[PDB]
């Protein structure tokens, strides 16, 4: 009901899940999938300057590598689910058994 | 006789005789049970 409470709780919980539960799984999957490549070379290696990975802002001081991009991602997931909860709880819709 | 049989079994002649017989059979079946739109026996 209280939008701030629900949003903050859900976002913090999603960040906790990303940081402590699914962290290693996601890192392993992104490692094994790798960068997108064309004709065997990555997009940057083919001459696409803008395809270069932004190595600057991706690095972090977190012990395990939790950086900016994944805080954005997990917080976005948390907010999406939080607003789904809020809208659906205040919608007043009721199915009939 | 033998050559008459041979020519009488050549594709066109055999086909025309077969189709004449089939047409006659179907015509008689329709005549006995005309205007049949379903199979009512079972």
């Amino acid at each position: 009901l209280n939008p701030s409470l629900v949003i903050s709780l859900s976002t913090g919980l999603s960040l906790f899940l990303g940081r402590f539960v699914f962290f290693n799984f996601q890192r392993e999957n992104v490692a094994k999938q790798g960068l997108p490549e064309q004709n065997g070379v990555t997009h940057f290696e083919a001459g696409d300057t803008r395809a270069k990975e932004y190595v600057s802002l991706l690095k972090s001081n977190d012990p395990v590598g939790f950086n900016i991009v994944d805080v954005l991602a997990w917080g976005s997931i948390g907010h999406i689910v939080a607003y789904y909860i809020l809208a659906t709880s205040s919608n007043g819709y009721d199915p009939k058994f | 006789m033998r050559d008459l049989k041979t020519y009488l079994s050549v594709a066109p002649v055999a086909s025309t005789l077969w189709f004449a017989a089939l047409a006659g059979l179907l015509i008689e079946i329709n005549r006995f049970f005309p205007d049949a739109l379903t199979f009512p026996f079972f």
Partner: protein, 193 residues
């Protein structure tokens, strides 16, 4: 052998616990698929075995059937009831989030393993009584586990299909109505209305 007189698949010898050569569709042809299949089978068997008593025991008591006990959630004021008393945190969004989080964490922790024998039979913290000491007695326990698990899976299938056949009834109710008049009240009326 699952079928006296039918030749057995080559990749199923009979050494695995519960191997009876049943694989008509030959799904376990590839060994790396067969290992995952074995783990999945044990997980399903364990869930069904831990569930079926859960479907039956509360029904035997003065509570509703397995489908009525999970109908309170469809109401605007849904609130759960355990052993005849209303639980406090019974409202749906709670139960839902707590269950999702606990199950996700436990399942991920389970999947973070690559033995792959402890993948199916982990042990340690999950074997307090320590029944896995004698390697051959452990094998017969494995056989009994898989057999009872398959039986429980079949029982759960029967429960669900009965529920579909007669909506709003429970397995014990079906058993009681069968015992009331065996011959007339059977599956036949369902098969041939």
């Amino acid at each position: 052998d699952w079928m006296p007189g039918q030749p057995r698949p080559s990749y199923l010898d009979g050494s695995a616990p519960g191997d009876f050569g049943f694989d008509p569709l030959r799904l376990g042809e590839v060994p790396e698929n067969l290992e995952r299949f074995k783990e999945s089978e044990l997980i399903h068997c364990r869930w069904a075995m831990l569930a079926v008593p859960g479907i039956l025991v509360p029904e035997a008591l003065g509570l509703g059937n397995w489908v009525k006990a999970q109908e309170w959630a469809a109401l605007p004021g849904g609130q759960a009831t355990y052993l005849g008393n209303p639980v406090p945190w019974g409202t749906l969004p709670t139960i839902l989030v707590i269950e999702f989080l606990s199950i996700a964490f436990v399942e991920h922790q389970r999947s973070m393993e690559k033995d792959p024998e402890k993948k199916k039979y982990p042990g340690g913290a999950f074997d307090p009584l320590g029944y896995s000491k004698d390697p051959k007695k452990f094998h017969e326990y494995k056989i009994k586990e898989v057999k009872n698990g398959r039986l429980a899976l079949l029982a759960f299938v029967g429960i669900c299909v009965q529920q579909s056949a007669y909506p709003g009834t429970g397995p014990l109710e079906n058993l009681a109505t069968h015992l009331a008049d065996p011959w007339h009240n059977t599956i036949g009326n369902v098969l041939i209305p």
